[PDB]
């Protein structure tokens, strides 16, 4: 008989019929704007590639901070409101160092991502006055690293959820990249061909030419600790497209 | 004609009714089917892992809580993980103070109170996750299921999550012969109950079933992937 | 005092590593000594016996 406006996506802590926090899954809608990131976790190691999307030549490429070192054995990729990524990464680094301090050991990747998720999920509890978010974060993360269980990769999005994923792409073209991934991905991947295939997909989903400055990627494998790729090695691996 | 009353949890509808709680129920219907039947000696939790992503390891339904208490979540992952931490804290404190395993039937009441507190204050949302608690204590197995309405029930078998009505019907049709079952038959019944929820085109593979058992002498042990082959094998076709 | 030292350099190492993570450059010896001194300045005359 009658149709009415009915707003349940405005305030946090509000359940729509079908029982879902629209407010949080709007923060999921925010990742759709950040740069595309690819993480491939092979038995030989794990690599993290990401487009950088420089706006103007006057911008220093090294300033754009899309892959960070949580510790010597955890690498992270950002996508979304990097203003939030800066506090999440700070939490991750502080937690890893606290764990190493208390427990004379290297913190496993799963526990790192679990602690970072613990920083999330404090969306609305403003009765707890000190320094809450009052909102979900706006960033989706890709924790890559090596630990007792071999190399592992984890994806977490602004819902406090993680999975021991591998070949998970996040960013504006995340689902198209994932569609390419599953049919390109394989269990027995040498780290070289993992980087190869990842850069091929990142190629097709780009704006600009692909060169050493448009993207930048890092790998961790049991051999060496966290390792960025320089302008040198980026050109060195893109000679062959 | 009730749009003004279904926004905050501290607003009674002019029908004697809190719409927000009833909307918190609807989160449980968005998880995945999970079954918690029990026998005279043991209690089990069969849950179906989410095949919603691909190529990524499925989520982790069954959660360790203590040596004698285990849980299965069928709601918001945030609230589930927030409640499991509180459960672990309660059990740890109980063993610290009285040096005894915390009885299940009191931990469940503590859950009820803690989940009721937000239901009444402004600026909070009900805990949108439904639990399935398998435990053993001085009085044998128990299966308690929790709702976002801060209302806990004592169940001889229950299923919560998507399409769980099929599993509930099946369990209701086979509740009598649950008390006298060896562990094998109990797990087979639970697997069948979980099976009657799925579409007939797919069968319970080893990569989406997460049996976890506690009982008299068995600690709460979670059986992840391929390790659930012994339980899953021998399961007849529909 | 062995425990007081061991603990305070352990925490100083934690802080140095956090700094190196954030600012991407190794912390200078002058900075680390001041960190440790400030950390131990609190608890003045509370019983510490550090001689680092």
């Amino acid at each position: 008989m009658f149709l009415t406006r009915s707003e349940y996506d405005r305030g946090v802590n509000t359940f729509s019929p079908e029982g879902r926090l629209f407010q949080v899954e709007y923060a999921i809608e925010a990742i759709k704007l950040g740069s595309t990131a690819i993480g491939i976790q092979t038995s030989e190691g794990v690599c993290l590639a990401v487009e950088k999307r420089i706006t103007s030549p006057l911008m220093e490429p090294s300033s754009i901070e899309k892959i960070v070192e949580i510790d010597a054995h955890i690498g992270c990729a950002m996508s979304g409101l990097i203003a939030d990524a800066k506090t999440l990464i700070d939490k991750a680094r502080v937690e890893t160092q606290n764990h190493w301090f208390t427990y004379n050991e290297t913190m496993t990747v799963e526990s790192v991502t679990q602690a970072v998720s613990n920083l999330a999920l404090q969306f609305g509890e403003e009765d707890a006055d000190p320094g809450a978010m009052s909102r979900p974060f706006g960033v989706a993360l890709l924790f890559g690293g090596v630990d007792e269980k071999g190399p592992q990769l984890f994806h977490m999005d602004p819902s406090g959820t993680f999975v021991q994923c591998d070949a998970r792409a996040i960013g504006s073209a995340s689902e198209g990249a994932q569609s390419s991934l599953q049919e390109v991905y394989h269990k027995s991947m040498t780290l070289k061909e993992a980087i190869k295939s990842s850069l091929i997909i990142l190629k097709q989903v780009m704006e600009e030419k692909l060169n050493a400055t448009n993207i930048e990627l890092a790998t961790v494998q049991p051999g060496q600790n966290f390792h960025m790729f320089t302008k040198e090695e980026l050109e060195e691996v893109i000679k062959d497209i | 004609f009730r749009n003004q009353y279904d926004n905050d949890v501290t607003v009674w509808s002019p029908q004697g009714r809190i719409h927000q709680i009833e909307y918190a129920m609807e989160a449980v219907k968005q998880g995945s089917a999970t079954v918690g039947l029990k026998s005279k000696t043991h209690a089990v939790l069969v849950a179906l892992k989410r095949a919603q992503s691909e190529l990524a390891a499925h989520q982790k339904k069954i959660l360790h809580v203590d040596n004698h208490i285990g849980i299965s979540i069928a709601g918001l992952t945030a609230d589930a993980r927030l409640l499991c931490n509180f459960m672990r804290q309660e059990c740890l404190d109980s063993r610290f103070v009285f040096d005894r395993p915390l009885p299940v039937s009191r931990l469940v009441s503590l859950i009820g109170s803690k989940t009721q507190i937000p239901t009444q204050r402004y600026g909070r949302r009900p805990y949108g996750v439904g639990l399935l608690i398998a435990g053993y204590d001085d009085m044998g197995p128990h299966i308690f299921q929790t709702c976002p309405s801060a209302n806990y029930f004592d169940c001889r078998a229950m299923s919560i999550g998507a399409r769980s009505q099929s599993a509930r019907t099946y369990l209701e049709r086979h509740m009598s012969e649950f008390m006298e079952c060896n562990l094998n038959e109990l797990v087979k019944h639970g697997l069948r109950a979980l099976r009657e929820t799925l579409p007939a085109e797919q069968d319970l593979t080893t990569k989406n079933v997460s049996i976890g058992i506690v009982g008299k002498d068995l600690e709460f042990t979670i059986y992840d992937d391929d390790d659930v082959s012994p339980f899953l094998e021998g399961l007849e076709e529909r | 005092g062995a425990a007081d030292c061991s603990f305070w350099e352990r925490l100083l190492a934690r802080q140095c590593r956090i700094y190196e993570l954030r600012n991407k450059e190794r912390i200078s010896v002058a900075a680390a000594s001041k960190l440790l001194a400030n950390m131990v300045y609190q608890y003045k005359g509370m019983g510490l016996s550090m001689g680092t």
């Binding site: 606290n98 301090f101 208390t102 | 740890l92 404190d93 610290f96 103070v97 | 925490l11 934690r14 950390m39």
Partner: peptide
């Protein structure tokens, strides 16, 4: 309950003869 050692008494964030 008096004090009833709550749990792990006090040990959180320790980072800043008779015994």
């Amino acid at each position: 309950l008096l004090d009833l050692g709550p749990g792990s008494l006090s040990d959180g964030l320790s980072l800043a003869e008779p015994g």
